[PDB]
């Protein structure tokens, strides 16, 4: 009944493993989206961060734009997002990330929309490998702003990402953490 | 209302770039409003409340917001477009050729079949409308999966060019909160109507 829950089952249930690193959720989060999942989802990081003063999200395109503004809609903050290509409008006060898949690309946002007076919470779909997070925490850092946290609506816990993140002091508030994606099968990190 | 909440966010914070280009990234196309696009998502689920849409289609990255806000409201599942390869889109690919007459250049746009079904009856929700190849190559994939148009729903038009008419022409209900009906000597204009 908790977005956890309903997410599980929807992993669960829709979610097709591809490999040992690959979970394809393109029926609800990547491709097709779930509006009313999305916004357990935002609620519930709203939920996690409502006594922590954030001013505003930085999410980055496509699959964490979704998860990102329902959050932003319940904390009543402003949500934005890094752009990954040239756009038409995206043209001064650039603040740059290097981003490299496991070569390299660039990831924006004007510094017109962060100020240090800004304390950000970060949205993302998915944490695995983290470069894209560091990469969103490097320009809300450059901006001057502070960083309130992650939210992370599937982290692969068996990849690097969030343990290079909670190294450097980060709060990582992850609503599914996957421990396996052997054998064809989603399993989930294991609660007391 | 949503139509003119969205009227004053465009007169106040919209910066008219060489006379012709709207810049809204401070609400729209960079950062993003939440609470202006749930009024927006909702106008548009008012407006076809009565149309029995199963779906919404869109494309990334700035109609996804306005897109999901609505999708929220009329209880569907909101799709989005595709204009680069994705790690896990391989699957029942539907394309569409979108032109742009700006820069002249053609590009390819991509939905995968499987969430489209021919029992579909299709919002389609776009940010701007202004020559209208994004919404046609929307248009196209519908029909390509056999599902059928009950109409598109745009946040902000550019109504002195030729993309709605174009849709219009061709039997599609367009709704577009903001019409547009000039940008000239650095300001904006809205169609009284
Ligand atoms: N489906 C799926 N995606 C994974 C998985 N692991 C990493 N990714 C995604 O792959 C991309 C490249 O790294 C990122 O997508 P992105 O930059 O967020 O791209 P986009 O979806 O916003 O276009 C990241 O979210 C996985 O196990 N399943
Ligand atoms: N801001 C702004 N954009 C305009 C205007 N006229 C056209 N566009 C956008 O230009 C792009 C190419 O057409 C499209 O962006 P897109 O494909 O939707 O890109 P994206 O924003 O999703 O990345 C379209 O929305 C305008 O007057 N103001
Ligand atoms: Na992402
Ligand atoms: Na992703
Ligand atoms: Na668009
Ligand atoms: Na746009």
Excluded: C, W
Excluded at 17 to 39: A, C, G, R, T, Y
Excluded at 85 to 112: P, R
Aim: overall charge negative; proline content about 2%.
């Amino acid at each position: 009944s908790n977005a956890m829950e309903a997410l599980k089952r929807k992993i669960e249930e829709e979610g097709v493993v591809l490999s040992d690193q690959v979970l394809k959720v393109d029926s609800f989060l990547n491709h097709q989206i779930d509006p009313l999942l999305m916004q357990r989802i935002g609620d519930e990081f709203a939920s996690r961060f409502a006594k922590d003063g954030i001013t505003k999200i930085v999410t980055i395109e496509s699959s964490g734009i979704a998860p990102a503004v329902m959050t932003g809609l319940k904390l009543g903050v402003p949500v934005v997002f890094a752009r990954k290509h040239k756009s038409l409008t995206l043209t001064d006060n650039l603040l740059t990330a290097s981003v490299y898949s496991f070569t390299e690309s660039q990831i924006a946002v004007s510094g017109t929309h962060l100020s240090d007076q800004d304390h950000v919470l970060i949205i993302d779909d998915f944490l695995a490998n983290g470069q894209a997070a560091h990469g969103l925490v490097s320009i809300v850092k450059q901006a001057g702003a502070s960083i309130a946290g992650i939210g992370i609506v599937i982290e692969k816990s068996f990849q690097p990402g969030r343990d290079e993140l909670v190294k450097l002091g980060y709060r990582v508030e992850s609503l599914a953490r996957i421990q396996s994606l052997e054998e064809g099968k989603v399993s989930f990190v294991q609660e007391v």
